[model samples]
Each structure stands twice: as structure tokens, then as C-alpha cells.
Target: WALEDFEIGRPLGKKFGNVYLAREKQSKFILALKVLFKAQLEKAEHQLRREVEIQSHLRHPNILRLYGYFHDATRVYLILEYAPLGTVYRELQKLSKFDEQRTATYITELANALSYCHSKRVIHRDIKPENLLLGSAGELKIANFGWSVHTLDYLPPEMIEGMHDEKVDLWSLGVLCYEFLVGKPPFEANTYQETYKRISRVEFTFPDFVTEGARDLISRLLKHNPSQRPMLREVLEHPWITANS
Candidate 1:
């Protein structure tokens, strides 16, 4: 379909150059159109291509669907599912830490989705609340892949030894779950170095207020040994998740 077939409206927050709210004139189907300038991402073309290849093949409820893409020499166009409820971060900013039930619900969906991605050999390197889009009824969607690679805060220790496996995403899921119960990440520190220090040393604490079941689930996911960390399937069936779900 031509770009003219979409009635593009105002920009939808920040993503690439501009992600506009768009609707197909014929089908009246609403979506988000991300416009990426080629020159800005020239050096990262291989990475972008990998992202497209991986995301396009994914068909899951919790992961945002990549409808298709188009490009010329100068700009690339990405058609994406429009999340009406916006990012989970927006809601987190409005409240204190989420209740156990709410946190469990979101985490369960994420675990299921992450498990699916791992089964396909596609690791979601970033699992922060900002990347999680919400449906009207609060279903989670892993929407952004811009930071879907090894990173400092969320990177697992095994990655330092040249390991980039499913555990990397597992560690991030632990961090993501902790952030739901607490306001910030468990390893947050004065600097990246300090944060890495905490992560490497496995220095983290759960406040007395956090439920035992929740703490148990977080402990299982955040182990220093990648091999020790529970798989996403295990996480989905954990007591806290099931009880809260």
C-alpha cells in the first residue's frame, strides 16, 4: 500500500524521527507509523535489519506485532500496532509501586512472551517498563526494540565472558519485576560502574514490606549464576504469579 493510503496524524511521542498516529483509509485500521531517517542509522543498518527480521516473524499476544515496513534511500517506514493505553511507565509514574496482583499480572504476561521469544531464539535484551506498551484493559506488549541488545544496567554477568543467551533477557525480567515492586531497579547506584558492581556482587535487598512470594519469585530470576536463574516457563508457574493471576 502507498503512504497516501494512511491518514497520518500528529506524532505519537518520540521514536526514531517521528512516530505518527495513522489509519488506513479503506480498512479504517489504526496503527503507529515510525519514520526513521536512513542517514542517522546508516552505521546500524545490520542491526536494524536483524530487528526487522526477528520482530516480523514473532506472532505473540504480549509482543507488539510488526505489520510491515517500507523504505526509499532516505527514510524507512515501520507500521506498528497502536497501543491505546500507552506505556506502563506512564502508569507507574502516576502511582507508587504497583500492587502485588497488578505486578504479578504484568510479569506473568511478560514471562509468557519472553518464553515464546526464547523458544524462537529471539532474546528481548530490554524489558523495562518504558518498552512495555499497554492495551486498554492493561495487557502488556514488548513494543520497542531500539535497545534490544546488550546494555550496562540490564546486561547479565555471563555476557562479560562473551555469553549472550536467553539468560540475558531473564536477568532483565528480574530487574523489571523488581522495579514494579520498588520504584527503581535493585542495582541502581551513583554511576554505571557502581551499578555494575552491585549487579556483579549480587547486592540487592527486598524491603520487609514486599511479600514473601514476590521476594521468592524475584530471587529465582535474579541469581548471579545465569545457570541458576529460573527459566521463563518456571517463572510463569511460580506461586506469586499464579496466586496473583
Candidate 2:
């Protein structure tokens, strides 16, 4: 067949091309041995090794699985489950990213994916559209397990601090949804310094062209207080989600 858009073979990962041997082949998979830190291998913080340990045990249809990892004297290798969608980054290049409907579909797919992961005691710390992979059938996948944590929803903000019940993901997801529908993150703060400040101090406003349901969902997700945000299950019940996803 024409390389069934999204299918995983055994360990070889041969079902998909674009295969590379480096720890960070693309931003698609976080490079355990990022060049920025390559010089520090002597110090060899060993965070990636820990990440590999945690990543190897987790599994979900929506998330890519870490099969195993290896390291040479000068290099590190992370063998991850091959997702044929090639990560949404590549899909965004071939397709037009995603539209409101497509975005909604992707969101629904992700919600279900996240829900499943959480049920298995997995929290996808990162849940942006970019982190999701599109299948041959236009289905979705929840990826980037490096930052995921297993937890419940509505925890205290500090309990997680950049990790937890998918609150951060809600913000990231909101940004992705807004961008998909409106063509950019609502905050649109590019600098690392400004992004957090804006997310924390600034308010979110939808455009005149935006729908009321969408604005409602996005507003809830962008809340400064992670605990104040809506859970993915509740979000699934929103009329917008019902009508869109």
C-alpha cells in the first residue's frame, strides 16, 4: 500500500521513513542530546537517561512509546515508537496546518487520547496541536511523553509547576486551537520572558470573527490559575465540542 499513513511496525521503525539515528532527529522528538547541551556531556547531567527510563514504561495509542535507548561514548540514541504521521510539524508543511473544523477534530481526538492516558495514570504535560500526530485517516495522536506526568485534574498550581493535570496543556491547547481557527496564539507572546508574563498577567480576547463557543473554551483554558481551568472531560461536554469534534 502507499505506506498506510499511520501504522507502527516492530522495533525497526521501518514502516515509516524520515528515520534518523540521532537522539534529536527533529524537534518532533526532543533530542536527549541537544547540541546546546552537547558540550556539557562531560558533566553529562543524565536527565535524558532518566527521561528514557520514564518514557519506556508509558504506553498509549495516542502517544508515541519509547522502545529503548542507548548511548555511545559520544552519542545517545532514543528508540521511540514510529508514528507514521511524522509528527504534526511535517503535516503542517504538507497540509495547511488545520482549520477550525480540523482543529476541533484534532482537539476531540486529543481529549479522548488524553483521557485514556490519564485513565492509565498518565498525564500528557504537553498537549499542543504540534505535539499531536495526524493519522492517514485524519485521526490524532498525543505525543511528546518526555514531559508527561501521571496525575488527576484540578490540582493546586504549585503542586505541578509546569507539570500536572494537563492545565499547562490546556493553555497550550487553547493557544493551538486559537491559532488553528484564528491563525495564532491568542497571547502571541514569542519571547520566553514575555510569554509567561502575558499568560499570567494578561487577559485573553477573541477576535470579532471568533465564535462565542470557541472564545468561551479558549478563555477557560488560558486562565492564569491552572486550578481554575476546565478539565478535558468537561470541555468534551461543551456544546462547541459536541458540535465540532
Candidate 3:
């Protein structure tokens, strides 16, 4: 549909581009319309195109749908599924951290979503909280593909140095789990270099309150060797996720 087919509303928030609440003129259906200026995205044109190609084909309850897109001389408009509750980053900031059950439920949804993506040869190289949205029911919906090709903070050792693959998502999942339970990233440090050092060494510790089951799952997923990390299926079947979810 053309941009005119939908009535754009107030700005939602900006990431790589402007996002607005929108409603279909005919169906009155609510959705998000992400507008990226061609000028601003000149250097990122390839990534933008890849994002559209990858995200449009993905179909999952826990994935933000890219229904369609259109472009004018100045801007590209992406029609997206509207998750009213907004980003997981915001929620985590407000609550500090999630309880085990909540974290597990989100992890379960994310694992299933990642599994689906991997089945289709899509690797969500970026899986941080800012890239995840919450639906009206507070269900997790993975979003933002601007970095799909990628995060340093969530990067596996392979990615930091040389060749990498889908396994990077596993390491990211581990980091995400830690942040969900602890309110901050495990390898976070005062300096970027220190964080990199910590990530390379796979050095981090769980808070005293973290459960053994959760720690076990995180440790397995956060291995420095990508091949050593648990597969998404194994992650889904992990005791902590299974028990809490």
C-alpha cells in the first residue's frame, strides 16, 4: 500500500529512523510506520534493503511483522506490526529486572522465534532488549533488523575476531538472560576495552540470588567457543526455561 493508504499519527520513537503510530484508512487497522530518509540511509542502503527482505518473510507470533513497504524520493516507509506496550528495554528499565518466570517466558518465546528464523536461514545477530518489543499481552516480539548483519556487547568470541555464524545468537541469548535477571549486562564495565576483555575471556559472575538452574543454562549458552553453545532446541529444553516457562 502507498503511504497515503494509512493515516500516520504521532511519533513513537527513533532508532535508525522515525517510527510513528499509523492507521489504515480503509480497515482502520493500527500499525507502526517506520520512515527512513533516503539521504540519511545512503551509507546503509544495503542493510536497509536486507532488513526488508529478511523481516518481511518471517512469520512468528514472537516476531514483529514487516507487512510491506513503499518509498518516495526522500523516504522509505515500512509497515510494521504495532506492539502497544513498547520496547522491552523500557520495561526492564522501569522494573530493574524480571522475575524468573517472566524472564523464562520471554526467553521461551525468543528461543522459538530464533528457531523459526534459523529454520529459514535467518540469523538475528542482534537480540538485545532494545530490539525486542512487548505486545498488549506483554508477549515478547523481536524487532529492529538494522543490525541484523549484528552488537559488540552481545557478540560471541568468534564474531569479535574472525568468522562467525548463527551461533552468535546463542551467545546473545545468554547475555540477554543475564541482563533480564540481573538488570545489567554481564560483561558491562567502565570502559569499552574492559568490556571487550571480559567478553573475550567469558568472565562474569552471577549475583548471589541467581538460581543454580539459571546459572547452568547461562553458562552453557555463553561459552567462548561457538560450537560449544547449546542449540536453540537444547536451550528451549533447558531445565530453567522449561520449569519456569
Give me the candidate number with maximum lDDT: 3
lDDT of 1 by residue, 1-245 (tens): 56877898877887356888999898899999888888778744767877777787788989998999888668788888888888998889888689888999999888888878877777777778888999767899997665454256666777653466568788888888888888778888889778878888888998888889989988888888888998788888898899898
lDDT of 2 by residue, 1-245 (tens): 11111232233222112244332323444322211124454464444454566567766565566766555555444555545555665566556446557767877777777667667766656555456665556567665565666522222233334544546666666666776776655555656555555555644577787888888887787676778878888878888878977
Off by over 4 Å in 1: 146-151, 160-163
* Residue pairs with backbone overlap in model 3: 147-150
Please state every model's RMSD to the true fold in angstroms.
Answer: 2.0, 8.3, 1.4
Best by TM-score: 3
Write down the lDDT that model 1 would get. 0.82
Better of 1 and 2 by lDDT: 1
- Reference-based TM-score of each model: 0.93, 0.69, 0.97
User: lDDT per prediction?
Assistant: 0.82, 0.58, 0.90
- Candidate 3 Cα RMSD after full superposition onto the native fold (Å): 1.4
True-structure lDDT of candidate 3: 0.90
lDDT of 3 at 245: 95
Clashing pairs in 1: none
